[PDB]
Design a protein around this ligand. Structure first.
Ligand SMILES: CC(=O)N[C@@H]1[C@@H](O)[C@H](O[C@@H]2O[C@H](CO)[C@H](O)[C@H](O[C@]3(C(=O)O)C[C@H](O)[C@@H](NC(C)=O)[C@H]([C@H](O)[C@H](O)CO)O3)[C@H]2O)[C@@H](CO)O[C@H]1O
Ligand SMILES: CC(=O)N[C@@H]1[C@@H](O)[C@H](O[C@@H]2O[C@H](CO)[C@H](O)[C@H](O[C@]3(C(=O)O)C[C@H](O)[C@@H](NC(C)=O)[C@H]([C@H](O)[C@H](O)CO)O3)[C@H]2O)[C@@H](CO)O[C@H]1O
Ligand SMILES: CC(=O)N[C@@H]1[C@@H](O)[C@H](O[C@@H]2O[C@H](CO)[C@H](O)[C@H](O[C@]3(C(=O)O)C[C@H](O)[C@@H](NC(C)=O)[C@H]([C@H](O)[C@H](O)CO)O3)[C@H]2O)[C@@H](CO)O[C@H]1O
Ligand SMILES: *[C@@H]1O[C@H](CO)[C@@H](O[C@@H]2O[C@H](CO)[C@@H](O)[C@H](O)[C@H]2NC(C)=O)[C@H](O)[C@H]1NC(C)=O
Ligand SMILES: *[C@@H]1O[C@H](CO)[C@@H](O)[C@H](O)[C@H]1NC(C)=O
Ligand SMILES: *[C@@H]1O[C@H](CO)[C@@H](O)[C@H](O)[C@H]1NC(C)=O
Ligand SMILES: *[C@@H]1O[C@H](CO)[C@@H](O)[C@H](O)[C@H]1NC(C)=O
Ligand SMILES: *[C@@H]1O[C@H](CO)[C@@H](O)[C@H](O)[C@H]1NC(C)=O
Ligand SMILES: *[C@@H]1O[C@H](CO)[C@@H](O)[C@H](O)[C@H]1NC(C)=O
Ligand SMILES: [Ca+2]
Ligand SMILES: [Ca+2]
Ligand SMILES: [Ca+2]
Lengths: 320, 172, 172, 323, 172, 320
């Protein structure tokens, strides 16, 4: 008999399932994802003065490995490190290696300054090796010099070299200690004398002795060249005294500014931007969470142990 | 639900209503019809848009690497990093699950309340000229043509115009 | 509370009712009686069951020892671990207190709403044959026997059957 | 005149207090605890191939201390360490001791492989001591050998020993460096010559030198033997060039799979099961939180500085009036 | 809002009411009145005070320094500390933003519910002696003097006293 | 026509904006701040037995630098360190420097115990230096003794000194190693014989060799005195075997109880109370959060990246 007006709400055929405080299987008219599952398989470097190191290891930039010849100097806001990158052509290792790598990966460029070190007539300062090839010929670490006695068997003379930091900023200096394979090798290069290498500044000092010892060959070489480093402050001097065994620096490094070190396996792309990176590439999502990797760098969504979290963007779905 | 309208006294939603979230269906001598309510629909959509602006974002804190991808590190410091990262990940996983669960509950109940608030404003409009049927409809006790129905939807229905006729028809 | 029924217009709960959370009491010419409502009770219990299933659990993440019980560790790494653990513990203590405080408020207000929703469906069903006394009861203006009272609880009460008698008693 | 129908809700005489956003003393019909207080003072090891070390310390398993003779080799999913566990019978310590201990407590077994170091007729390999007793007599670390000169006073000849890893996985190798109590004691074993122990590998290099000096007695001995260790990779070797002072390994170790390390004093119980452990037993609760200890291991409830947190499992309790 | 009263069917608030949060205005033959409701006002205030007691506080945990202000600590551990602190800072920033947003929503809706519960309490008291005008007022269909108005505010208004007079005026 | 009663709520002219879940510009009748922005630029020390070290560095308390003469012993619950605090008057540094500083800043006092070290007629134990001035005259670290040969040029005798810990608490023992500027200096002080210093206890052992080497002058001195330390347990002995180069302890230290270490530049204030401190001052607030600094100590509000977070203490403000 009477006229009527009915009130209602919309609905859909296929609803989306979401979770609430009280219900794990709650159907709603629409929902949207909050955990990012997918990544771009690229390092997105638009709006960034970047540097892809290739097969050059960050430490190789400072000592000057053949692989790092294009990366001895420069400026950048982002530095990309790659897998199986070469730091040392000659067998050996750097003492306090990981901290040095982290310092370089936090920097925004490298300048190089000459030490100015010179050597007497009885020293040969241009010693080379088969392990460090350059231009199809024998060579050595570009920023260092292998000092040996010019006449084979003669005693390496007592030499004292001092580098002064004339800059207003902090400088980084590296050197190496040759540890020979045999006792005869040691006598041919440096002499029968007992070897000793002292290094000293206002903020650092240490002593080093070459050690003759048999050990397994790496690329046909049982000898080693281990590296050491320190920071030389503005105005301060650092003094090397040595009578054979020092791998002396021809140049020192200055780490300039700040930058974002990335370790990744993904190729560069300059057509698009990103603020979040990982091993597999870039994460350009607007979502607050991600499940790709717990290891990321930059401004990133927070990693969560969840495949999906649907956020409801609609009422309960109650279909006809 | 918290407010009793959606998944409650309103038996089900309308799949045919594609022009809005909430609305009206009527019947009279002229025939049936349908129309969406813009005010209540927009009230719900604005609140969900507000949630998305707050939730769909990340922090602007620049994080650096503390785990090396291509080399090893000290076992003790690595265990502390692994413990800290897994503890932080447990917090963010938990916080994400709680946020979404809490927000989903509130979104559902908010939408339920907007339906009820619309229902309530129509009841007070009609005043003593109509009665509730229990399923979300109002049985109007007078001749209410397309213009009369439009005025109820438009919030311009004057109850005193039809009060005499309606009170007689209700009492019988 | 939020919905005004429990600790509100309903003065107090019934300690005698031990076969349900919500229910009815009636008085007619034949006698008195009590009967619990199954649907509203089960809705309240099912929602609380969902909270317990969601809350009463732990993470699957396996943590290892980073502090030695029976020996000392490095001083600087021990300070960092102590700072991190206390910081993590402050977060979980805060989150636990916030979780349970938030859940308790919602559980209380949810149960309040289910009382209101049962009150509302009964009101809409009785229509013009009853009036609210303000204390959670309906004064019914006709002879409503035990079969009539059952139809109110089972949701099969047709208002039109008793409408003529009820309006004469209401108008007086 | 009118018949009446009343709606209502249930209640109880004495309810339970809970906390809400707006009220500390909120009464409800029932509630349940979310913070675990109690704990079984036992190690629950059902469904776990466990290993209770007792007096043996994890590092002692690698070097072969008298107390760790039964626990030299084995496999497990859970390794248990106890208080005052003996690692070193002879006085000394290991460099990166905690890193090594955590590696062993992370593993799920140890296998032993012989080095195959033979020495010439001017070397005394079976060097025992009073500190490391075995079967009512003087002995040494079972996985090592104390190398000294045959002739007392004569110089220790510069012998070379190399071990190649011919296995798919990494091999952990350990050695010791003796530090004599005096120059009299130093000259008897190794001689008047200058001592130098240079270990060499493809991925590791270090030079060690013995240290003569006056020290107080630990177990009646002023001298010490410090231990050093490294990982020998697959298809790789490690060469020891030494002239006295080096304590050479007769065997090396290999850490198998993974397992859970528990440092606790409580005893084993095989009837119960649990996934969370601490110093004073196991935590078998289903609840999300606990206030026993912040130091736990395994899949655990999160630690909180709270005695109780009651979660409401019912409505507000509005009881009937009382006279 | 959730309950539909504040910023809803009640058009706006009263700046002239300085002695309470909620209240009554009335018009009768005797005069124009205004009065605050103490019970609903205090219920809202107590609930907000309870939040302030809960939220406005800090943890008892003693935190020592793990970063030197005037000297440079080791580089690797310094990065771990920087990462861990920035992660903890992101959690607390998020927790604080969520807390205040959640509580502000609940405070606004709680206040809305107290307005509705008072309105509903008055509606059920008046019974058939008044009608709702849609704007949060009740049109009372009998002579309701200052004592009558006070009885409505005091929650002791007896509808039966004026029922006969009121029903005649409503039907006209 | 009929009498009426209207329900309503209060409003205000001065509204306040707050953020909700659904709305970022929500106006309410009242609101209150949850993040503390302002700081008291002072150290609030009411109810604290405190020690302001001034220009004395915590490590200087143990070795006895002139600037630390009035802070050689004491008790405290709060220890305050300042910027540019003097630890070493003579050029050098301590091994595990930060770990030692953190131990001292965690303690609640220092007590000094005599070593009882005596030396023969051929040793001069009263070595002093112009680097360590005290009342306008040459002096030395108060808790240590610079041992040299009485006759200039002669060999320093093979000396043995042993300290026994008679206390029930652990004792902190410090010593120094002199590293000469040149060989001529080294011979004058300790003789031409080869120098060797050995320290040994139950829980600790080490060997130190004085190093003559070329390095720049710090405060006119190319020499260095480096320090080392260890904990001697109750009942245990520690023995020093040396023949030139040792800077031997005349007293050892005992760290007593626990305390709160603060590093800050702000002036002291004894009228104000606090439980939270930072570089720039104190944080007395009752609020749960603060945006002053991420580095704080004590019972503190949590740091957040937010200027303001307004908690609503009132309903929606709907004016007119
Ligand atoms: C039969 C056998 O296996 N004999 C090895 C013998 O090959 C090896 O000698 C070294 O072998 C390598 C690889 O063939 C190089 O030829 C070494 O020569 C050079 C080098 O290129 O590295 C020549 C170079 O001019 C030298 N440079 C300087 C500055 O002296 C260096 C240098 O002497 C050494 O690298 C120092 O370690 O060597 C050649 O010496 C020997 C030694 O490893 O071992 C036999 O068993
Ligand atoms: C009456 C008298 O004074 N007799 C001494 C006699 O004490 C001394 O014997 C040596 O004393 C030292 C210091 O007390 C050690 O106790 C020596 O014991 C052992 C040990 O058990 O540790 C014996 C063991 O066989 C030795 N092992 C090897 C491989 O040489 C070790 C080892 O030398 C040291 O531990 C190295 O630091 O010492 C004990 O022999 C003798 C010594 O010549 O002289 C008498 O006159
Ligand atoms: C031209 C030049 O630069 N020459 C320096 C020369 O100055 C320097 O001599 C030292 O100069 C300093 C001044 O800064 C002191 O005068 C040194 O004397 C004392 C000292 O006060 O420190 C005297 C003191 O009695 C000595 N104490 C003892 C226990 O021996 C000490 C002590 O020998 C030294 O500190 C040890 O290094 O020195 C004065 O020697 C010399 C030496 O650094 O170097 C020239 O190049
Ligand atoms: C940890 O973070 C702090 C603060 O961001 C770093 O200290 C800053 O270092 C830069 C140089 O890179 C200076 O310009 C700032 O003045 C420093 N600020 C403060 C407050 O100290 C610190 O370098 C970081 N640690 C590491 C190891 O990178
Ligand atoms: C569902 O919600 C999302 C929120 O991101 C929105 O993009 C979309 O337009 C909504 N509607 C439909 C029909 O998908
Ligand atoms: C940290 O976790 C990763 C998980 O893949 C593991 O590979 C690594 O060994 C762990 N670090 C340590 C020190 O155990
Ligand atoms: C870390 O906390 C434990 C337990 O409170 C304490 O014994 C230890 O001294 C703390 N570590 C440091 C380095 O102070
Ligand atoms: C709380 O309520 C019931 C009834 O009192 C009690 O028996 C039980 O322990 C609790 N029930 C649940 C589901 O937690
Ligand atoms: C606003 O809230 C604060 C904090 O609770 C309170 O102290 C103050 O009295 C309130 N202001 C007014 C004007 O009511
Ligand atoms: Ca691990
Ligand atoms: Ca501490
Ligand atoms: Ca950094």
């Amino acid at each position: 008999d009477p006229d009527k007006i009915c009130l209602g709400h919309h609905a859909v055929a296929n609803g989306t399932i979401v979770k609430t405080l009280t219900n794990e299987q709650e159907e709603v008219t629409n929902a949207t994802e909050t955990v990012e599952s997918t990544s771009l398989n690229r390092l997105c470097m638009k709006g960034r003065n970047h540097k892809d190191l290739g097969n050059c290891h960050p430490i190789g930039m400072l000592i000057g490995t053949p692989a790092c010849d294009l990366h001895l100097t420069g400026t950048w806001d982002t530095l990309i490190e790659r897998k199986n990158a070469i730091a040392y052509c000659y067998p050996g290792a750097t003492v306090n290696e990981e901290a040095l790598r982290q310092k370089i990966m936090e920097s925004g460029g490298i300048s190089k300054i000459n030490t100015g070190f010179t050597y007497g007539s009885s020293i040969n300062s241009a010693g080379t090796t088969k392990a460090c090839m350059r231009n199809g010929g024998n060579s050595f670490y570009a920023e260092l010099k292998w000092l040996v006695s010019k006449n084979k068997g003669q005693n390496f003379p007592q030499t004292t070299n001092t580098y002064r930091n004339a800059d207003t900023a902090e400088h980084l200096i590296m050197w190496g200690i040759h540890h020979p394979s045999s006792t005869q090798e040691k006598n041919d290069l440096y002499g029968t004398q007992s070897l000793s290498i002292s290094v000293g500044s206002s903020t650092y000092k240490n002593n080093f002795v070459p050690v003759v010892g048999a050990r397994p060959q790496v690329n046909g070489l049982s000898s080693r060249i281990d590296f050491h480093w320190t920071l030389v402050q503005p105005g301060d001097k650092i003094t090397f005294s040595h009578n054979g065994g020092l791998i002396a620096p021809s140049r020192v490094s200055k780490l300039i500014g700040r930058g974002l070190g990335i370790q990744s396996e993904a190729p560069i792309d300059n057509s698009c931007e990103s603020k979040c990176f990982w091993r597999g590439g870039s994460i350009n999502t607007r979502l607050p969470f991600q499940n790709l990797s717990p290891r990321t760098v930059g401004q990133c969504p927070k990693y969560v142990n969840k495949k999906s979290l649907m956020l409801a963007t609609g009422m309960r779905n109650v279909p006809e | 639900g918290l407010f009793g309208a959606i998944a409650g006294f309103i038996e089900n939603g309308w799949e045919g209503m594609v022009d809005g979230w909430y609305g009206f269906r009527h019947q009279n001598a002229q025939g049936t019809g349908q129309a969406a309510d813009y005010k209540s629909t927009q009230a719900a959509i604005d609140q969900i848009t507000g949630k998305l602006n707050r939730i769909i974002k990340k922090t602007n804190t620049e994080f650096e690497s503390i785990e090396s991808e291509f080399s090893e590190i000290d076992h003790q410091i690595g265990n502390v990093i692994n413990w800290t990262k897994d503890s932080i990940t447990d917090i963010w996983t938990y916080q994400a699950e709680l946020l979404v669960a809490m927000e989903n509950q509130h979104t559902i109940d908010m939408a339920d309340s907007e339906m009820l608030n619309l229902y309530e404003r129509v009841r007070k409009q009609l005043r003593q000229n109509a009665e509730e049927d229990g399923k979300g409809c109002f049985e109007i006790y007078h001749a209410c043509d397309d213009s009369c129905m439009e005025s109820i939807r438009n919030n311009t229905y004057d109850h005193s115009q039809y009060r005499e006729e309606a009170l007689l028809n209700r009492l019988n």
